[PDB]
């Protein structure tokens, strides 16, 4: 199997405009939303049909209760941060947790928090400690690091539980997540050569330009990998043409174990 990841995000907002939720949580496998909860629906619900089909109503009912508890803990935690930063107005608090199962079989795990969209606290599950970015974080770090049982619980969850959930969801969603749609690749002129790929899945792809068999990264413009809307992706890369000398340019594309070369005549 290729590399895969499972991640859960929380967002709290302290003074949201009317109608907008003070709390949202979304889970992802790779790029795919799999679950969603917010303080307006107050229900945890599937976001992918293969989650809805493989997890019984008692799963959703239970995690709905757990996310209502998270919603309240996030409100309290954000109230305390904003008081300690001495900040008025609307501020955000975010959490991200997850793991990756790499192609070679190795694993990774991560857990971190942000305040107003900037790193705040970062967990190291090998040294069993929290990195604090400022003195407000440093106060929280002290309280959390005094609870060594909870550090050990988080290490176990990242290393064993998260990877087990990920393998379970990967099997649920295998028709979607383990498929391969190769790219359709073309070269155009607009003076620069554009190497364009579309229709591919998974989104991970590597496109570059080589000039007389040499790669010059600082000369290449790299487009983003963008969703096409139908479950596949598109991307591009461009390089500027030298009007004073001929050169042999080639677009190189790697995707899911297959390499492609388009030599420009």
């Amino acid at each position, epitope marked *: 199997m290729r590399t895969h990841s499972l991640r859960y995000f929380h967002l709290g907002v302290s003074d949201p405009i009317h109608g907008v939720p003070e709390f949202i949580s979304v889970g992802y496998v790779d790029s795919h939303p799999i679950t969603t909860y917010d303080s307006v629906t107050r229900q945890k619900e599937p976001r992918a049909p293969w989650m809805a089909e493989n997890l019984a109503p008692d799963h959703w009912e239970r995690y709905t209760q*757990l996310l*209502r*508890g998270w919603q*309240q803990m996030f409100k309290v935690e954000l109230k305390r941060l904003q008081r300690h930063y001495n900040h008025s107005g609307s501020h955000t608090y975010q959490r991200m947790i997850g793991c990756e199962l790499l192609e070679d079989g190795s694993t990774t795990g991560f857990l971190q928090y942000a305040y107003d969209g900037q790193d705040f606290l970062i967990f190291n599950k090998d040294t069993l400690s929290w990195l604090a970015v400022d003195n407000v974080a440093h106060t929280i770090k002290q309280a959390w690091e005094a609870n060594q049982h909870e550090l*050990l*619980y*988080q290490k*176990n969850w990242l290393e064993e*539980e998260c990877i*087990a959930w990920l393998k379970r969801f990967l099997e649920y969603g295998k028709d979607t997540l383990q498929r391969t749609e190769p790219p359709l690749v073309r070269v155009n002129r607009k003076t620069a050569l554009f190497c364009k790929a579309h229709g591919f899945y998974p989104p991970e792809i590597y496109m570059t330009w080589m000039k007389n068999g040499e790669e010059i990264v600082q000369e290449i413009d790299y487009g983003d990998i963008l969703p096409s809307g139908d479950g596949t992706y598109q991307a591009w890369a461009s390089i500027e043409l030298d009007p004073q000398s001929s050169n042999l340019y080639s677009c190189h594309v790697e995707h899911s174990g297959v390499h492609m070369v388009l030599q420009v005549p």
Partner: antibody, heavy 108, light 116 residues
Framework: QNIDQPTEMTATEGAIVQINCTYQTSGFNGLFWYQQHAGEAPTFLSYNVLDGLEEKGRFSSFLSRSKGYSYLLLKELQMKDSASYLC??????????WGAGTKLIIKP | NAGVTQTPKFQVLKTGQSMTLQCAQDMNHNSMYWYRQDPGMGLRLIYYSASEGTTDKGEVPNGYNVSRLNKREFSLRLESAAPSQTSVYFCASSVWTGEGSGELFFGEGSRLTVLE
């Protein structure tokens, strides 16, 4: 899913006793031991979630995740250690599964 | 600084009679629980309340209902007592539901006997 511990154990004052707890669960988020004197409320003794031994006073708690087993070790037993000992495991959905409890009887 | 206070300690009931058990905690805990304990088996959750403003069934909800009246209090209602509800009932609380390692703090227990 199930959790198993002996119904009762009897040992002599001053000695050592090991109370075993084995569990079969889908997922594992840690194992708890509680003490419950006859007619009283359970109170928290220990929590293990990685492999190994943790000491607290005369009581130690051991966990092996791969064999799905823990023990509560009581050294230098006293009469006041007479009680039931309950083990509980937190499963993949963070729900506790409780063992039926081990009644420890101490011979003076 | 009382911890978890539940009442009553003892109660005899006739089949069909109604009863409310009370439970309060002064620990500013978010999560509360009602368990029954019977001989030969582990504690069984009846209903729980992960946070103020929400409740849900446990493993043995039938014949019971609960009210999370506020952050402190979580009552257990037996609308029409059955002899199978003879048991010892424990209320418990924890700081919240997300603390993986968080322990339960128990009340002193309520012994109920239901007789025809």
């Amino acid at each position: 899913q199930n959790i198993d511990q002996p119904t009762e154990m009897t040992a002599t004052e001053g000695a050592i006793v090991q109370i075993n707890c084995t569990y079969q669960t889908s997922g594992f988020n840690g194992l708890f031991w509680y003490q419950q004197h006859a007619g009283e409320a359970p109170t928290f003794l220990s929590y293990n979630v990685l492999d190994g031994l943790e000491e607290k006073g005369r009581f130690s708690s051991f966990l092996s995740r791969s064999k799905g087993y823990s023990y509560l070790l009581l050294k230098e037993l006293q009469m006041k250690d007479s009680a039931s000992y309950l083990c509980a495991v937190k499963d993949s959905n963070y729900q506790l599964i409780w063992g039926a409890g081990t009644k420890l009887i101490i011979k003076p | 600084n009382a911890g978890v206070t539940q009442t009553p300690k003892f109660q005899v009931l006739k089949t069909g009679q109604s009863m409310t058990l009370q439970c309060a905690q002064d620990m500013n805990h978010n999560s509360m629980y009602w368990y029954r304990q019977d001989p030969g088996m582990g504690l069984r959750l009846i209903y729980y309340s992960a946070s103020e403003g929400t409740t849900d069934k446990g493993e043995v909800p039938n014949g019971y209902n609960v009210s999370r009246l506020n952050k402190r209090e979580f009552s257990l209602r037996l609308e029409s007592a059955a002899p199978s509800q003879t048991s010892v009932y424990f209320c418990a609380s924890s700081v919240w539901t997300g603390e993986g390692s968080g322990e339960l703090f128990f009340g002193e227990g309520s012994r109920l006997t239901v007789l025809e």
